[PDB]
């Protein structure tokens, strides 16, 4: 990719999510996907 070219970058390991942790924070999924893996 950028026309588009070949790029050599440090691998991201994925998006740097910061979990909204606290002694009272909870996350619940309201929906689901039937994944036919």
């Amino acid at each position: 990719q950028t026309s588009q070219s070949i790029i050599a970058y440090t691998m991201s390991l994925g998006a740097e999510n910061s979990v909204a942790y606290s002694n009272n924070s909870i996350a619940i999924p309201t929906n689901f996907t039937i994944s036919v893996t």
Partner: protein
């Protein structure tokens, strides 16, 4: 209560399986990989019938009828040493790869048992997410498990508390999590969001409001009083 949704997501996902198999090259990456492993094993085996290993040639007829016997015996001995080491190498990598295939097949038998013949509670054993049911497909020299998994999708945030003591008795969730949207406290199963009102049916009593930290106050209702009201 979501039967159309699960059925339609299953149908859409198997349709995506069709599309991925038709379009993606390595959609059968593991089984096409193993078929190619067998193909290269056999092809290397056959091409070793074109390898010298120090001999003049590999087609035995020209070794026999190209030069004098006295050292033709030695040369054919070298050729058979090379062929026999090639066959031993082939057979021992067939044994190592058959230990791989037998780990895969003991895993596929364990997967048939715990995925098709039952439900596996092992995490990520029948696919990423909470496994529902697998389907065997008699794919060439292998099996394709349509790992129907449950993947929870739309996360949120709520306020939680380890225990909810009503009148000095810490209440705990029988199975689920104590959560709140900001003003009302609900208990929800750990893997899908149902806000359920708090009652002694899904909460049990142990301890007091001090030995546990994070405990908050909320009413834990009782169903006997409204029934006795009339």
């Amino acid at each position: 209560e979501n039967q159309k949704l699960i059925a339609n997501q299953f149908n859409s996902a198997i349709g995506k399986i069709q599309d991925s198999l038709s379009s993606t090259a390595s959609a059968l990456g593991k089984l096409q990989n193993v078929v190619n492993q067998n193909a290269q094993a056999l092809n290397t085996l056959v091409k070793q019938l074109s390898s010298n290993f120090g001999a003049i040639s590999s087609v035995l007829n020209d070794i026999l009828s190209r030069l004098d016997p006295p050292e033709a015996e030695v040369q054919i001995d070298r050729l058979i040493t090379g062929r026999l080491q090639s066959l031993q190498t082939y057979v021992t990598q067939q044994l190592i790869r058959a230990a791989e295939i037998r780990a895969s097949a003991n895993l596929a038998a364990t997967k048939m048992s715990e995925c098709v013949l039952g439900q596996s509670k092992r995490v990520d054993f029948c696919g990423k997410g909470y496994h529902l049911m697998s389907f065997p497909q008699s794919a060439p020299h292998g099996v394709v498990f349509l790992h129907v998994t449950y993947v929870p999708a739309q996360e949120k945030n709520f306020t939680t508390a380890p225990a909810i003591c009503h009148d000095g008795k810490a209440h705990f969730p029988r199975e689920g999590v104590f959560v709140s949207n900001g003003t009302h406290w609900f208990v929800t199963q750990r893997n899908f969001y149902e806000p359920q009102i708090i009652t002694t049916d899904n909460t049990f009593v142990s301890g007091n409001c001090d030995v546990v930290i994070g405990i908050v106050n909320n009413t834990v209702y009782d169903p006997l009083q409204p029934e006795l009201d009339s």
